[PDB]
Coordinates of all heavy atoms in Angstrom, one line a residue:
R1 N 104.4 108.1 148.0 CA 103.7 107.6 149.1 C 102.6 108.7 149.6 O 102.9 109.5 150.4 CB 104.8 107.3 150.2 CG 104.2 106.7 151.5 CD 103.5 105.4 150.9 NE 102.9 104.7 152.1 CZ 103.5 103.9 153.1 NH1 104.8 103.7 153.0 NH2 102.8 103.4 154.1
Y2 N 101.5 108.5 149.0 CA 100.7 109.5 149.0 C 100.0 110.0 150.3 O 99.7 111.1 150.5 CB 99.6 109.3 147.8 CG 100.1 109.4 146.4 CD1 100.4 108.2 145.9 CD2 100.3 110.5 145.8 CE1 101.0 108.2 144.5 CE2 100.8 110.6 144.6 CZ 101.2 109.6 143.8 OH 101.7 109.6 142.6
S3 N 99.7 109.0 151.1 CA 98.9 109.3 152.4 C 99.8 110.0 153.5 O 99.2 110.5 154.4 CB 98.4 108.1 152.9 OG 97.3 107.5 151.9
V4 N 101.1 110.0 153.1 CA 102.0 110.8 154.1 C 102.4 112.1 153.6 O 103.1 112.8 154.2 CB 103.2 109.9 154.5 CG1 104.2 109.9 153.4 CG2 103.7 110.3 155.9
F5 N 102.0 112.4 152.4 CA 102.3 113.6 151.6 C 101.6 114.7 152.4 O 102.3 116.0 152.6 CB 101.9 113.6 150.2 CG 102.7 112.7 149.4 CD1 102.3 112.6 148.1 CD2 104.0 112.4 149.8 CE1 103.1 111.7 147.4 CE2 104.8 111.7 148.9 CZ 104.3 111.3 147.7
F6 N 100.4 114.7 152.8 CA 99.7 115.8 153.5 C 100.3 115.9 155.0 O 100.3 116.9 155.5 CB 98.2 115.4 153.5 CG 97.7 115.5 152.3 CD1 96.6 114.6 151.8 CD2 98.2 116.2 151.2 CE1 96.0 114.6 150.6 CE2 97.6 116.3 149.8 CZ 96.6 115.4 149.6
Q7 N 100.7 114.9 155.6 CA 101.3 114.9 156.8 C 102.7 115.6 156.8 O 102.9 116.6 157.5 CB 101.7 113.4 157.4 CG 100.4 112.6 157.4 CD 99.5 113.3 158.5 OE1 98.3 113.8 158.1 NE2 99.8 113.1 159.7
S8 N 103.5 115.2 155.8 CA 104.8 115.8 155.7 C 104.6 117.2 155.2 O 105.4 118.1 155.6 CB 105.6 114.9 154.7 OG 104.8 114.6 153.6
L9 N 103.7 117.5 154.3 CA 103.4 118.8 153.9 C 102.9 119.7 155.0 O 103.3 121.0 154.9 CB 102.4 118.9 152.8 CG 102.0 120.1 151.9 CD1 101.7 119.8 150.5 CD2 100.7 120.8 152.5
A10 N 102.2 119.2 155.9 CA 101.8 120.0 157.0 C 103.0 120.3 158.0 O 103.0 121.4 158.5 CB 100.8 119.1 157.8
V11 N 103.9 119.3 158.1 CA 105.1 119.6 158.8 C 105.9 120.7 158.1 O 106.3 121.8 158.8 CB 106.0 118.3 158.9 CG1 107.3 118.6 159.6 CG2 105.3 117.2 159.7
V12 N 106.1 120.6 156.8 CA 106.9 121.8 156.1 C 106.2 123.0 156.2 O 106.8 124.1 156.2 CB 107.3 121.2 154.7 CG1 107.9 122.3 153.9 CG2 108.1 120.0 154.8
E13 N 104.9 122.9 156.1 CA 104.1 124.2 156.1 C 104.1 124.9 157.5 O 104.2 126.1 157.6 CB 102.6 124.0 155.7 CG 101.7 125.2 155.7 CD 102.2 126.4 154.8 OE1 102.9 126.1 153.8 OE2 101.8 127.5 155.1
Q14 N 103.9 124.0 158.6 CA 104.1 124.7 159.9 C 105.5 125.2 160.1 O 105.7 126.1 160.9 CB 103.7 123.7 160.9 CG 102.2 123.4 160.9 CD 101.3 124.8 161.1 OE1 100.7 125.2 160.1 NE2 101.4 125.4 162.2
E15 N 106.6 124.5 159.4 CA 107.9 125.2 159.5 C 107.9 126.5 158.7 O 108.7 127.4 159.1 CB 108.9 124.2 159.0 CG 110.3 124.7 159.1 CD 110.7 124.9 160.5 OE1 110.3 124.2 161.3 OE2 111.5 125.8 160.7
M16 N 107.1 126.5 157.7 CA 107.0 127.7 156.8 C 106.5 128.9 157.5 O 106.7 130.1 157.1 CB 106.3 127.3 155.5 CG 106.4 128.3 154.4 SD 108.0 128.3 153.5 CE 107.9 126.7 152.7
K17 N 105.7 128.7 158.5 CA 105.0 129.9 159.3 C 106.1 130.7 160.0 O 105.8 132.0 159.8 CB 104.0 129.3 160.3 CG 103.0 128.3 159.7 CD 101.9 128.9 159.0 CE 101.0 128.0 158.3 NZ 100.2 127.4 159.4
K18 N 106.9 130.2 160.7 CA 107.8 131.0 161.6 C 109.2 131.2 161.0 O 110.1 131.7 161.7 CB 107.9 130.4 163.0 CG 106.5 130.3 163.6 CD 106.7 129.5 164.9 CE 107.4 130.4 165.9 NZ 106.6 131.5 166.3
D19 N 109.4 130.9 159.8 CA 110.7 131.1 159.0 C 110.6 132.3 158.1 O 109.5 132.4 157.4 CB 111.1 129.9 158.3 CG 112.6 129.9 157.8 OD1 113.3 130.9 158.1 OD2 113.0 128.9 157.3
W20 N 111.6 133.3 158.4 CA 111.6 134.5 157.5 C 111.7 134.4 156.0 O 111.9 133.2 155.6 CB 112.5 135.4 158.1 CG 113.9 135.0 158.0 CD1 114.7 135.3 156.9 CD2 114.6 134.0 158.7 NE1 116.0 134.5 157.0 CE2 115.9 133.8 158.2 CE3 114.3 133.4 160.0 CZ2 116.9 133.0 158.8 CZ3 115.2 132.6 160.6 CH2 116.5 132.4 159.9
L21 N 111.6 135.4 155.2 CA 111.7 135.5 153.8 C 110.7 134.5 153.2 O 110.8 134.1 152.0 CB 113.0 135.4 153.3 CG 114.1 134.3 153.5 CD1 114.0 133.1 152.6 CD2 115.4 135.0 153.4
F22 N 109.6 134.1 153.8 CA 108.6 133.1 153.4 C 107.3 133.5 153.4 O 106.3 132.8 153.3 CB 108.9 131.8 154.2 CG 110.0 131.0 153.9 CD1 110.7 130.2 154.8 CD2 110.6 131.0 152.6 CE1 111.8 129.4 154.4 CE2 111.6 130.3 152.3 CZ 112.4 129.5 153.1
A23 N 107.1 134.8 154.0 CA 105.7 135.4 154.0 C 105.2 135.6 152.5 O 103.9 135.6 152.3 CB 105.8 136.8 154.6
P24 N 106.1 135.9 151.4 CA 105.4 135.8 150.1 C 105.4 134.3 149.5 O 105.0 134.2 148.3 CB 106.4 136.6 149.1 CG 107.1 137.4 150.1 CD 107.3 136.6 151.4
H25 N 105.3 133.3 150.4 CA 105.7 132.0 149.9 C 104.8 131.0 150.5 O 104.3 130.0 149.9 CB 107.1 131.6 150.1 CG 108.0 132.6 149.5 ND1 108.5 133.7 150.2 CD2 108.7 132.6 148.4 CE1 109.2 134.4 149.5 NE2 109.5 133.7 148.3
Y26 N 104.3 131.3 151.8 CA 103.7 130.1 152.6 C 102.4 129.7 152.0 O 102.0 128.6 152.4 CB 103.5 130.7 154.1 CG 102.5 131.7 154.3 CD1 101.3 131.4 154.9 CD2 102.6 133.1 153.9 CE1 100.3 132.3 155.0 CE2 101.6 134.0 154.0 CZ 100.4 133.6 154.7 OH 99.4 134.5 154.8
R27 N 101.7 130.6 151.3 CA 100.4 130.1 150.6 C 100.7 129.6 149.2 O 99.9 128.7 148.8 CB 99.4 131.2 150.6 CG 98.9 131.5 152.0 CD 97.8 132.7 152.0 NE 96.5 132.3 151.6 CZ 95.5 133.2 151.3 NH1 95.8 134.5 151.5 NH2 94.4 132.9 150.9
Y28 N 101.7 130.1 148.5 CA 101.9 129.7 147.3 C 102.6 128.3 147.3 O 102.3 127.5 146.4 CB 102.9 130.7 146.7 CG 103.3 130.4 145.2 CD1 102.4 130.5 144.2 CD2 104.6 129.9 144.9 CE1 102.7 130.1 142.8 CE2 104.9 129.5 143.7 CZ 104.0 129.6 142.5 OH 104.4 129.3 141.3
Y29 N 103.3 128.0 148.3 CA 104.1 126.8 148.3 C 103.2 125.6 148.5 O 103.5 124.5 147.9 CB 105.1 126.9 149.6 CG 105.9 125.7 149.8 CD1 107.2 125.5 149.1 CD2 105.7 124.7 150.8 CE1 107.9 124.5 149.3 CE2 106.5 123.7 151.0 CZ 107.6 123.6 150.1 OH 108.5 122.5 150.3
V30 N 102.1 125.8 149.2 CA 101.2 124.7 149.4 C 100.7 124.3 148.2 O 100.8 122.9 147.9 CB 100.0 125.2 150.3 CG1 98.9 124.2 150.5 CG2 100.4 125.8 151.6
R31 N 99.9 125.1 147.4 CA 99.3 124.6 146.1 C 100.4 124.3 145.2 O 100.2 123.4 144.2 CB 98.4 125.6 145.6 CG 99.1 126.8 144.9 CD 98.0 127.6 144.2 NE 97.4 126.8 143.2 CZ 96.1 127.1 142.5 NH1 95.5 128.2 143.0 NH2 95.7 126.3 141.6
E32 N 101.6 124.9 145.3 CA 102.8 124.5 144.4 C 103.2 123.1 144.5 O 103.3 122.3 143.6 CB 103.9 125.5 144.7 CG 105.1 125.2 144.0 CD 104.9 125.5 142.4 OE1 104.1 126.4 142.2 OE2 105.5 124.8 141.6
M33 N 103.3 122.7 145.8 CA 103.8 121.2 146.0 C 102.6 120.4 145.7 O 102.8 119.2 145.4 CB 104.5 121.1 147.3 CG 105.7 121.9 147.4 SD 106.8 121.7 146.1 CE 107.2 120.0 146.2
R34 N 101.3 120.7 146.1 CA 100.3 120.0 145.8 C 100.2 119.7 144.2 O 100.1 118.4 143.9 CB 99.0 120.6 146.2 CG 98.8 120.5 147.8 CD 97.5 121.0 148.3 NE 97.4 120.9 149.8 CZ 96.5 121.4 150.5 NH1 95.6 122.2 150.0 NH2 96.4 121.3 151.8
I35 N 100.1 120.7 143.4 CA 100.1 120.3 142.0 C 101.3 119.8 141.5 O 101.2 119.0 140.5 CB 99.7 121.8 141.3 CG1 99.3 121.6 139.9 CG2 101.0 122.6 141.2 CD1 98.5 122.8 139.3
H36 N 102.4 120.0 142.2 CA 103.7 119.2 141.8 C 103.6 117.7 142.0 O 104.1 117.0 141.1 CB 104.9 119.9 142.5 CG 106.2 119.4 142.1 ND1 106.8 119.6 141.0 CD2 107.0 118.5 142.8 CE1 107.9 119.0 140.9 NE2 108.0 118.2 142.0
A37 N 102.9 117.3 143.1 CA 102.7 115.9 143.3 C 101.6 115.3 142.4 O 101.7 114.3 141.7 CB 102.3 115.6 144.7
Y38 N 100.5 116.2 142.0 CA 99.5 115.9 141.3 C 99.9 115.8 139.8 O 99.1 115.2 139.0 CB 98.3 116.9 141.4 CG 97.7 116.9 142.8 CD1 97.0 118.1 143.1 CD2 97.8 115.8 143.5 CE1 96.4 118.0 144.4 CE2 97.1 115.7 144.9 CZ 96.5 116.9 145.2 OH 95.9 116.9 146.4
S39 N 101.0 116.3 139.3 CA 101.7 116.1 138.0 C 101.8 114.7 137.7 O 101.2 114.1 136.8 CB 103.0 116.9 138.1 OG 103.9 116.4 138.9
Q40 N 102.7 114.0 138.6 CA 102.8 112.6 138.2 C 101.6 111.8 138.8 O 101.5 110.6 138.2 CB 104.1 112.1 138.9 CG 104.1 112.0 140.5 CD 105.5 111.5 141.0 OE1 106.4 111.1 140.2 NE2 105.6 111.4 142.2
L41 N 100.8 112.3 139.6 CA 99.5 111.6 139.9 C 98.5 111.6 138.7 O 97.9 110.7 138.6 CB 98.9 112.3 141.0 CG 97.5 111.8 141.6 CD1 97.6 111.8 143.1 CD2 96.4 112.6 141.2
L42 N 98.6 112.6 137.9 CA 97.9 112.7 136.6 C 98.6 111.8 135.5 O 98.1 111.3 134.6 CB 97.5 113.9 136.1 CG 96.2 114.6 136.5 CD1 96.1 114.9 138.0 CD2 95.9 115.8 135.6
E43 N 100.0 111.8 135.7 CA 100.8 111.0 134.7 C 100.5 109.5 135.0 O 100.8 108.6 134.1 CB 102.3 111.3 134.9 CG 103.3 110.6 133.9 CD 103.1 111.0 132.5 OE1 102.6 112.1 132.2 OE2 103.3 110.1 131.6
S44 N 100.1 109.2 136.2 CA 99.8 107.7 136.7 C 98.8 107.1 135.7 O 99.2 106.0 135.1 CB 99.1 107.7 138.0 OG 99.9 108.5 138.9

């Protein structure tokens, strides 16, 4: 459900801001899950 992915990713990323042990992660996680969805989006 592609059009809510950026909404829900924004939710999870704003949760990623103020949660600890996630400072080495909060920028990596963004493109990680983006390319992870884009995996089957290219498989499409």
Side-chain angles (χ1 to χ4, degrees):
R1 186 63 185 271
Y2 288 97
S3 295
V4 79
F5 286 166
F6 294 145
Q7 301 300 108
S8 49
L9 185 144
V11 175
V12 177
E13 175 61 27
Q14 290 303 111
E15 184 62 36
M16 192 70 72
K17 301 291 179 66
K18 298 175 70 66
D19 194 357
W20 63 93
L21 56 83
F22 283 152
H25 306 83
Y26 73 105
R27 294 176 75 186
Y28 180 73
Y29 183 82
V30 177
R31 75 171 299 160
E32 178 66 32
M33 298 309 293
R34 282 181 179 175
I35 198 163
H36 183 73
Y38 293 158
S39 65
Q40 68 179 358
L41 182 141
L42 265 70
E43 183 65 31
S44 308

